[PDB]
C-alpha cells in the first residue's frame, strides 16, 4: 500500500447520524458536521507503523500506532478508549475500540486506499456507519 500523504476531504456522509447515536445534541451535531467538512488528514506510514494527524479549523489530534499493537486514543465523541488495528486486505485496515470507562455504543473505524487514489475513512457506532472520502492535496 501506501497511506502516506496529505489528504483533504471531498465528501462526508452520515456523520450527523453517527453523532446522534453517540448522544450529541442537535445544535452541536450541526456545528460538528460543518467542522468535519474542513477535515484534513496527514499520514506518515513506515511499514506497519502509522503516524496520523487529523485536523479541522480549530483542532488537531495525533494518532500513532503499530498494526497489531494496542494503543490508546479517543472515540469520535471524545471518550478515551483502547484500540487495536488489523489489516483486512492489502490496502484496508480496521480498528476495534473498547471504552476505558463505562458503557456506550460499539465503535470502530476503518481506513482504505482505493485503486483510484482516494482515502476512505469509515467510523461506526453500532448500526450506523459514517463514510468520509479524501483525495491527496
Ligand atoms: C484513522 C483516522 C481517524 C481515526 C479519524 C479520526 C477523526 C476524528 C476523530 C474526527 C472527529 C471530528 C468530530 C468528532 C467532530 C468535529 C469534526 C471532526 C472531523 C474533527
Outline of the structure:
This protein is mostly beta strands and 137 residues long.
Describe what this molecule looks like in 3D.
This protein has 137 residues and is mainly β. It has a single domain (1-137), classed as Beta Barrel (Lipocalin), CATH 2.40.128. The protein has two helices and ten strands. The protein has helices spanning 15-21, 26-36, and strands at residues 5-13, 40-46, 49-55, 60-66, 71-74, 80-89, 92-99, 107-113, 119-125, 128-136. A ten-stranded antiparallel sheet has the order 4-3-2-1-10-9-8-7-6-5. A hairpin with a 2-residue loop joins strand 9 and strand 10. The structure holds retinal. Retinal is lined by residues 32, 35-36, 39, 52, 54, 56, 59, 63, 76, 109, 111, 121. Retinal (RET) binds at residues 32, 35-36, 39, 52, 54, 56, 59, 63, 76, 109, 111, 121.
Number of helices: 2
The level of helicity is 10-25%
**Strand count, sense and closure of the main sheet?**
10 strands, antiparallel
Strand arrangement within the widest β-sheet reads: 4-3-2-1-10-9-8-7-6-5
* CATH hierarchy: architecture: Beta Barrel
The CATH topology corresponds to Lipocalin
Which CATH class is shown? Answer: Mainly Beta
Number of strands: 10
Radius of gyration: 14 Å
What percentage of the residues does DSSP assign to strands (E)? over 45%
What binds here, in terms of ligands, is: retinal
CATH H level: which superfamily? Calycin beta-barrel core domain
Binding site for all-trans-retinoate: 132-134
Cross-link (Glycyl lysine isopeptide (Lys-Gly) (interchain with G-Cter in SUMO)): 101
Motif (Nuclear localization signal): 20-30
GO molecular function: cyclin binding; fatty acid binding; retinal binding; retinoic acid binding; retinoid binding; retinol binding
